[PDB]
RNA sequence: CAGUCCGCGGAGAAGCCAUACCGGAAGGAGUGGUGGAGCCGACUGAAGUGCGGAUGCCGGCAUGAGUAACGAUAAAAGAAG
RNA sequence: CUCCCAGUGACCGAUAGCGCAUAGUACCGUGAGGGAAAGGUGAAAAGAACCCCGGGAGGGGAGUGAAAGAGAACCUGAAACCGUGGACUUACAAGCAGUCAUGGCACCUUAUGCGUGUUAUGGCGUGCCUAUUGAAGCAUGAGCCGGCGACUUAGACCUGACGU
């Protein structure tokens, strides 16, 4: 029994070409380069999914020391004062949302600063 | 000797090259002594008048 | 306002192509032909009649004749009013290609592409707007 | 305003309908009463072990599987490509505590 | 999940430079431009204040630096080499010195170019921008 | 039975080795290494310096009895 | 491809085309659009059975590009058809 | 044994199968000799009277027909590749072409969402294979898409695992 490739190959090809649809030039329309661009695409995907936490952690911290210094403390001293009172265990992201609500942030700043004295 | 081009030239850069091949439409203008159109500083092809009739046909 | 199946729609609605003309297999490079076909496009079908007639290219002949057929079937077949007609559409796609051998130096041959042209134009009433 | 701190539950002064990671109490039965470390009720901010005084209830709404993700991995010149499926289970809940 | 805002703010400030070290003042202006003083609401957008230096020509270089500091800048041409202007004779056009610092620390990207806009050096005691009504801000940091 | 319910005994038929056929299993080179005499058949069984050679003491016939314990 | 079931089909099969759905992956479904005559699903058996590469082969179509040239430097011009 | 005949097939079905769906023709060679592509209206020709633009060629109507979304470059008609139109965009930009994130615009037929298309800015980021101590390499291969294309068969063989 013969069994030519036929419909199989072209199914696979169209799948790849359909993953690759934002892409520039023949990264979008030829298979070979489509599949090749997707190789590095997989690398970059799997990297960023756990690096994105690094970036967002940066953005949280970076937003926290801004209000810290806005009041005349700073990130290192302010989280050391929110740690020196045991009871503050909220994530930095929630300290950011508080940095978007100045009154509560200042309440935590005076709380923290009443713990390094 | 024998220079050759290196990498095949892409669709897009090719089109930027051809960006200048746009044709220039003739500035046609209608014959005062006839119906049809005529090129400026030429005789009307249809009538043959450059002021009287100039060409035969 | 629609039928049962495509088998019925094929019988009852026969689908016409108003304003349409196409000139197939024109022995010319399309690449050359579009150069004028762009000039015509979107313009009053009389300006197309005049433009096409002074632009100085061999390719202007076939693109002339088609334009008439567009207007012809715009008027004989489609009841359209010729003081409305205009070039709503114009484009050329490539037809087949005659390939020929051509000898070159030191005994090599090459292959040479005599491209054909499918010019096509679709006039319509300037009743749009 | 306020949000779940992902690590399990636990949050601050909200009122909404948010997803989170799965709860091991199935149905809408849970009626979960979570502890919260912060609150702006009455615009009166309260935090710390003050927030171990207050607690907020919230019914469980629905168990669920999130939008699909592939796990793809690559390394150059080694052949080696990898590909796997994944969707994260969760238990969406709506809030109505103190 | 995270709050982001609109770029609705536009804020104007007059940094002084007289008696200040260069660099010390320059990092303060680079921080205010790049947005760190307000809750740096995004990397994506430039929310920094507009910064109007005055009396820049009274700037202080704290070492021997007023001499022997150098200012290499290449004109593409060979022999267009290190076209070294270096010193206090660059205080023949003082303002660019200060620019060159903060642009030394402002980002090198598309955005990083574009923020240099908002740096408004003025070597004299006077500036045009009274229509902006810039707000005073002290050279000491804390 | 009804014959589409037939199945051979579990583990009474293993499938083949499709050596070749890419990165999910047994890839570029099949089972073979990188180079060497792993190419097309030929050598058989001998070390190709020396034979492991020993002397021969020699005789040609025999004729056994059938055995009955 | 084969054997045996279950079936489907001119109110329309395979094939082709989109698609945000589904399984852990190879994959597989739903719906829509061509198409117009055969075909899916399950169990088993056999294979010419899975391609990006071999300056691989047959084929079509690109780039160079409207580029080099139009094959002796014995020139051609007007009328009229 | 099989030029030839019949029958049959877990044999092929137009790059397969004989080289040939016919042809040892075309074509290549002074010669001995080498040596191709192959195909498909439709049920039936009813194979498009007649009219229109054009010398034509080609096309639009009308009819025939179930279908002309079949019309003789006549089954389907994938990809490269060439175009036409519309959304979003682009003319201080440095760039393995992507990856995550945020915003702007568009849209709502597995689809008002942990949405689809696009996009600006931020961060991040040395094509693939091979051969290698070591590859983004300025090491090899490769224009691009398709399709052919490589671990098989044999035997009263030897050896092992599993099953009866
Ligand atoms: Mg990355
Ligand atoms: Mg030379
Ligand atoms: Mg009818
Ligand atoms: Mg052809
Ligand atoms: Mg390695
Ligand atoms: Mg294996
Ligand atoms: Mg090898
Ligand atoms: Mg070796
Ligand atoms: Mg041998
Ligand atoms: Mg032997
Ligand atoms: Mg159907
Ligand atoms: Mg599918
Ligand atoms: Mg039929
Ligand atoms: Mg079949
Ligand atoms: Mg094979
Ligand atoms: Mg390979
Ligand atoms: Mg290939
Ligand atoms: Mg080729
Ligand atoms: Mg030239
Ligand atoms: Mg020339
Ligand atoms: Mg010559
Ligand atoms: Mg003559
Ligand atoms: Mg005369
Ligand atoms: Mg054949
Ligand atoms: Mg074929
Ligand atoms: Mg033959
Ligand atoms: Mg002959
Ligand atoms: Mg024809
Ligand atoms: Mg047709
Ligand atoms: Mg058709
Ligand atoms: Mg025909
Ligand atoms: Mg048929
Ligand atoms: Mg066809
Ligand atoms: Mg710009
Ligand atoms: Mg550039
Ligand atoms: Mg790498
Ligand atoms: Mg070496
Ligand atoms: Mg290389
Ligand atoms: Mg090369
Ligand atoms: Mg024997
Ligand atoms: Mg045994």
From Swiss-Prot, chain B:
One annotated GO molecular function: zinc ion binding
Cofactor note: Binds 1 zinc ion per subunit.
Obligatory cofactor(s): Zn(2+)
Keyword Ribosomal protein on entry: yes
Zinc finger (C4-type): 31-47
Domain of life: Bacteria
Region of interest (Disordered), residue spans: 1-32
Gene Ontology cellular-component terms listed: large ribosomal subunit
Membrane-spanning intervals of the chain: none
GO biological process, one term: translation
Any Pfam family hit: Ribosomal_L32p
Residue ranges, compositional bias (Basic residues): 1-21
InterPro entries, alphabetized: Ribosomal_bL32, Ribosomal_bL32_bact, Ribosomal_zn-bd
Keyword Transmembrane helix belongs to the record: no
SUPFAM superfamilies: Zn-binding ribosomal proteins
Binding annotation for Zn(2+): 31, 34, 44, 47
Keyword entries, A-Z: Metal-binding, Ribonucleoprotein, Ribosomal protein, RNA-binding, rRNA-binding, Zinc, Zinc-finger
Gene3D superfamilies named in the record: Single helix bin
PANTHER family named among the record's database cross-references: 50S RIBOSOMAL PROTEIN L32 (PTHR35534), LARGE RIBOSOMAL SUBUNIT PROTEIN BL32 (PTHR35534:SF1)
Entry's family note: Belongs to the bacterial ribosomal protein bL32 family.
Function comment: Forms a cluster with L17 and L22, and with L22, a pair of 'tweezers' that hold together all the domains of the 23S rRNA. Interacts with the antibiotic troleandomycin which blocks the peptide exit tunnel.
HAMAP family: Ribosomal_bL32
Subunit structure, as described in the record: Part of the 50S ribosomal subunit. Contacts proteins L17 and L22.
Protein name as catalogued: Large ribosomal subunit protein bL32
Origin organism lineage: Bacteria, Thermotogati, Deinococcota, Deinococci, Deinococcales
From Swiss-Prot, chain D:
MF (Gene Ontology): rRNA binding; structural constituent of ribosome
Listed InterPro entries: bL21-like (IPR028909), bL21-like_sf (IPR036164), Ribosomal_bL21 (IPR001787)
Keyword Iron set for record: no
Database matches in SUPFAM superfamilies: L21p-like
GO biological process: translation
Domain of life per record: Bacteria
Function in brief: Binds directly to 23S rRNA, probably serving to organize its structure.
Family: Belongs to the bacterial ribosomal protein bL21 family.
Identification of the protein by name: Large ribosomal subunit protein bL21
Organism listed in the record: Deinococcus radiodurans (strain ATCC 13939 / DSM 20539 / JCM 16871 / CCUG 27074 / LMG 4051 / NBRC 15346 / NCIMB 9279 / VKM B-1422 / R1)
Gene: rplU
UniProtKB/Swiss-Prot annotation, chain E:
Alphabetized UniProt keyword annotations: Ribonucleoprotein, Ribosomal protein, RNA-binding, rRNA-binding
Region annotation (Disordered) ranges: 124-142
Residues of the full protein shown: 30 to 171 of 174
Family note: Belongs to the universal ribosomal protein uL13 family.
Primary role: This protein is one of the early assembly proteins of the 50S ribosomal subunit. Binds to the 23S rRNA.
Name of the protein this chain belongs to: Large ribosomal subunit protein uL13
Protein species of origin: Deinococcus radiodurans (strain ATCC 13939 / DSM 20539 / JCM 16871 / CCUG 27074 / LMG 4051 / NBRC 15346 / NCIMB 9279 / VKM B-1422 / R1)
GO molecular function, one term: rRNA binding
Gene Ontology CC terms, in alphabetical order: cytosolic large ribosomal subunit; ribosome
Biological process per Gene Ontology, one example term: translation
Highest taxon of source: Bacteria
Residue ranges of coiled coil: none
Record-annotated disulphide pairs: none
Self-association and partners: Part of the 50S ribosomal subunit. Contacts proteins L3 and L20.
From Swiss-Prot, chain F:
Chain spans, region Disordered: 1-48
Superkingdom assignment: Bacteria
Binding partners and assembly: Part of the 50S ribosomal subunit. Contacts proteins L4, L21 and L35.
Similarity field: Belongs to the universal ribosomal protein uL15 family.
Role description: Binds to the 23S rRNA.
Name of this protein: Large ribosomal subunit protein uL15
Gene from which the chain derives: rplO
């Amino acid at each position: 029994p013969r069994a030519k490739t036929g419909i199989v190959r072209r199914r696979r090809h169209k799948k790849v070409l359909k993953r690759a649809k934002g892409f520039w030039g023949s990264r979008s329309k030829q298979y070979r380069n489509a599949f090749q661009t997707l190789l590095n695409a997989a690398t970059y995907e799997y990297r960023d999914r756990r690096n994105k936490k690094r970036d967002f952690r940066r953005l949280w911290i970076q937003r926290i020391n801004a209000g810290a210094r806005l009041h005349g403390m700073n990130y290192s001293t302010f989280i050391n004062g929110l740690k020196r009172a045991n009871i503050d265990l909220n994530r930095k992201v929630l300290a950011d949302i508080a940095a978007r609500e100045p009154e509560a942030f200042k309440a935590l700043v005076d709380a923290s600063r009443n713990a390094r004295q | 000797k024998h220079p050759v081009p290196k990498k095949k030239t892409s669709k897009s850069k090719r089109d930027m090259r051809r960006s200048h091949h746009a044709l220039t439409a003739p500035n046609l203008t209608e014959c005062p002594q006839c119906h049809g159109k005529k090129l400026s500083h030429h005789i009307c092809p249809n009538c043959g008048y450059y002021d009287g009739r100039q060409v035969l046909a | 306002q629609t039928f049962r199946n495509k088998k019925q729609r094929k019988q009852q609605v026969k689908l016409r192509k108003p304003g349409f003309a196409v000139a197939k297999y024109v022995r010319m490079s399309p690449r050359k032909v579009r150069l004028v076909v762009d000039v015509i496009r979107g313009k009053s079908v009389q300006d197309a009649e005049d433009l096409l007639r002074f632009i100085p290219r061999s390719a202007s002949e076939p693109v002339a004749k088609v334009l008439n057929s567009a207007k012809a079937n715009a008027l004989h077949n489609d009841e359209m009013l010729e003081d409305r007609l205009f070039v709503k559409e114009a484009y050329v796609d490539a037809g087949p290609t005659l390939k020929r051998l051509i000898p070159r130096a030191r005994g090599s041959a090459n292959i040479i592409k005599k491209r054909t042209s499918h010019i096509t134009i679709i006039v319509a009433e300037k009743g749009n707007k | 305003m306020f949000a779940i701190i992902q690590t399990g539950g636990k949050q601050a002064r909200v009122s909404e309908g948010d997803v989170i990671r799965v709860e091991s109490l199935q149905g809408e039965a849970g009626d979960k009463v979570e502890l919260k470390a912060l609150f702006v009720g009455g615009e009166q901010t309260v935090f710390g072990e003050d927030a171990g005084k207050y607690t907020v209830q919230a019914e469980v709404v629905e168990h669920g599987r999130g939008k699909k993700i592939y796990i793809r991995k690559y390394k150059s010149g080694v052949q080696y490509r990898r590909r796997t499926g994944h969707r994260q289970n969760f238990t969406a809940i709506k809030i109505l505590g103190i | 999940k995270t709050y982001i805002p609109k770029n609705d703010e536009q804020n104007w400030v007059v940094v002084d430079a007289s008696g200040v070290p260069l660099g010390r003042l320059a990092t303060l202006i680079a921080s205010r431009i790049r947005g760190k003083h307000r809750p740096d609401f995004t990397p994506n957008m430039i929310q920094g204040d507009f910064v109007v230096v005055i009396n820049a020509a009274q700037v202080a270089l704290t070492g021997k630096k007023l001499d022997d500091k150098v200012y290499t800048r290449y004109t593409g041409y060979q022999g267009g080499l290190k076209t070294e202007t270096a010193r206090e004779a660059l205080s023949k056009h003082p303002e660019r010195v200060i620019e060159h610092a903060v642009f030394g620390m402002l980002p090198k990207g598309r955005q990083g170019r574009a923020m240099h806009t908002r740096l408004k050096v003025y070597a004299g005691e006077t500036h045009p921008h009274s229509a902006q009504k810039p707000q005073v801000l002290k050279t000491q940091p804390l | 039975m009804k014959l589409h319910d037939l199945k051979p005994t579990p583990g009474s038929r293993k499938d083949r080795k499709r050596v070749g056929r890419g990165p999910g299993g047994t890839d570029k080179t099949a089972g073979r290494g990188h180079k060497g005499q792993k190419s097309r058949s030929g050598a058989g069984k001998g070390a190709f310096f020396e034979g492991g050679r020993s002397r021969l003491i020699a005789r040609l016939p025999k004729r056994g009895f059938n055995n009955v314990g």
